[PDB]
Design a binder for this molecule. Structure first.
Ligand SMILES: C[C@H](N)c1ccc(NC(=O)C2CC2)cc1
Ligand SMILES: [Cl-]
Ligand SMILES: [Zn+2]
Ligand SMILES: [Zn+2]
Length: 572
């Protein structure tokens, strides 16, 4: 409590000593409330290039509504039973060891962090305006040093969350989290090769092949239960099991990592704007409050742990979660040592998102440990058995399903897919404003090249992608604000051959493809089923008159070097 958070709280009061009021109509029951001060401050814009080249979608409500525009955060998960706590501690210990077998924890550097902000990544930050300026500035780094020495002392002053649910910190606090825990992401601890259940850095062009490899194992159905608000269901017990990564560390790193876990995770402080505008300073010891990248890695870890325990329950490794016997602890340990790795290989896990192919379908009704860890399944009654999938091409994972698509030469593509309304509606939105015509065009080109690489097998996206790349100057570089092989000025057929043939470990014959017409689509009915507008009069007019749309956008951007990509299609 206040011994660890006082300094942060005390500091904030003093900066707004001419506003501090301890309001008694504060909406908080779970969150600890400390005080309030005076504040007054705060949407998605449409990409006109993508929209002008996707006119049929102007009348599809699923597309157009995506561009318009709580009581989950203010909740508390109960303390798990003692047998649940033991299962979790034993499993967490074994899993950190397995992840650490071929990796060395290590500090991440200012140089690494500096290069990260100069290249623009979503670091979620807030004397300086841009984070680029601070990295260049040198007082900021003295500010970092002060906090750093404070962390070594066992104290914290400026590591405070701002809710808006995404929790931004000042860039200095992000540095210190990245210094301590950045190795998890930077050194690929959750790669499939090192974690077995993981998919970090794999790419959407690999996920479908990975699900198909899981399908090949003997077992029962494939289960893909989503958790109801995963971040809100992270217990202090989960935070303490995650902290055990510091047991693999040494020297300063160990102290710095212990400090982030103790001070910024296990005992948080947040400033939330309440319109009644006032800034409430509240605190809590549980729930997920980190950086989006460390959040990913620790969500993956705790999800792997929860799913191995659910598997153990389905195999009857333990009887009851209320209490674990000394023989049952022995059995859990022997299971992990004898089949732990095999059971990890039966899963694909990406943060909160999982697919499990258990040994058999007893897993479907193995609910006691899962419910008691507080990982309550979304949209199903607490004690109703999971509905599993019998076909790997039906299984949802990372917002996608995967099709098996056979090339005219017999080689097999496993391709990612989702409702086409979702793909078109996302490409039509630009995050933040201040965008030039050129920047908006380069974002449209990023979507177009992504569609050519991942969604080529959809007829409407190949056409629209060719149109947008025809409408945007040939040499303009794609921008943004997975592995992203579409972010390049190289020829998109050359990248396709590299990603789908040369570098594709499931493709034995490495014969290059010479043209886009060699590259197949879904079935006409599978395409429409997935949402193609084909067969519609509004769509055929768009395909027929596409050069007119292209020319409208060329006229707006002006007199530039353009390429006609439309003849890559045999029809044009
Ligand atoms: C080969 C090229 N990808 C292409 C172009 C248009 C269609 N559209 C249909 O077949 C609609 C009428 C039912 C199919 C394929
Ligand atoms: Cl199915
Ligand atoms: Zn701090
Ligand atoms: Zn599909």
């Amino acid at each position: 409590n206040l011994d660890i958070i006082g300094k942060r709280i005390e500091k904030i009061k003093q900066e707004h000593e001419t506003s501090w009021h301890y309001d008694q109509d504060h909406p908080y029951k779970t969150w600890a409330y400390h005080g309030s001060y005076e504040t007054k401050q705060t949407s998605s814009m449409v990409n006109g290039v993508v929209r002008l080249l996707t006119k049929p979608w102007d009348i599809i409500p699923m597309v157009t509504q995506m561009a318009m525009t709580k009581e989950k955060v203010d909740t508390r998960t109960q303390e798990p039973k003692e047998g649940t706590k033991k299962l979790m501690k034993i499993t967490a210990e074994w899993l950190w060891k397995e992840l650490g077998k071929k990796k060395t924890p290590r500090m991440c550097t200012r140089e690494e962090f500096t290069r990260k902000v100069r290249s623009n990544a979503a670091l979620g930050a807030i004397k300086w305006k841009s984070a680029r300026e601070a990295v260049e500035d040198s007082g900021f780094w003295e500010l970092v040093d002060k906090e750093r020495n404070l962390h070594l002392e066992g104290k914290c002053e400026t590591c405070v969350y701002n809710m808006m649910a995404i929790w931004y910190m000042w860039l200095g606090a992000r540095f210190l989290e990245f210094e301590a825990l950045g190795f998890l992401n930077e050194d690929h601890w959750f790669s499939r090769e090192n974690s077995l259940s993981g998919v970090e850095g794999e790419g959407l062009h690999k996920l479908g092949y990975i699900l198909r490899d899981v399908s090949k194992k003997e077992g029962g159905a494939m289960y893909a239960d989503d958790t109801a608000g995963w971040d809100t269901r992270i217990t202090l017990e989960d935070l303490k099991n995650e902290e055990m990564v510091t047991n693999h560390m040494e020297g300063e790193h160990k102290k710095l990592a212990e400090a982030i876990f103790k001070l910024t995770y296990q005992n948080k402080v947040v400033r939330v704007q309440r319109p009644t505008t006032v800034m409430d300073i509240i605190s809590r010891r549980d729930q997920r409050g980190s950086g989006q990248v460390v959040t990913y890695g620790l969500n993956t870890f705790t999800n792997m742990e929860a799913q191995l325990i659910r598997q153990m329950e389905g195999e009857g490794v333990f009887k009851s979660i209320q209490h674990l016997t000394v023989t049952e602890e022995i059995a859990v340990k022997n299971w992990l040592v004898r089949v732990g790795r095999e059971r990890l290989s039966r899963m694909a896990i990406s943060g909160d998102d999982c697919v499990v192919k258990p040994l058999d379908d007893r897993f479907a009704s193995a609910l006691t440990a899962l419910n008691d860890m507080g990982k309550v399944r979304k949209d199903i009654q607490q004690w109703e058995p999971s509905r599993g999938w019998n076909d790997w091409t039906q299984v949802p994972f990372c917002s996608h399903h995967f099709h098996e698509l056979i090339m005219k030469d017999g080689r097999v593509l496993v391709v990612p897919c989702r409702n086409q309304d979702e793909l078109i509606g996302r490409a039509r939105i630009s995050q933040g404003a201040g965008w030039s015509l050129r920047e908006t065009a380069c974002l449209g080109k990023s979507y177009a090249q992504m569609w050519s690489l991942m969604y080529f097998h959809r007829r409407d996206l190949r056409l629209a992608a060719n149109a947008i790349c025809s409408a945007v100057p040939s040499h303009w570089v794609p921008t943004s604000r997975a592995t992203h092989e579409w972010m390049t000025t190289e020829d998109m057929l050359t990248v396709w051959n590299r990603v789908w043939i040369q570098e594709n470990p499931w493709m034995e014959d490495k014969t290059p493809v010479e043209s886009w017409e060699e590259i197949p689509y879904l079935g006409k009915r599978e395409d429409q089923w997935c949402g193609s507008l084909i067969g519609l009069t509004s769509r055929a007019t768009w395909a027929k008159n596409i050069q007119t749309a292209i020319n409208q956008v060329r006229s707006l951007i002006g007199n530039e070097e353009y390429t006609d990509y439309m003849p890559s299609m045999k029809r044009f």
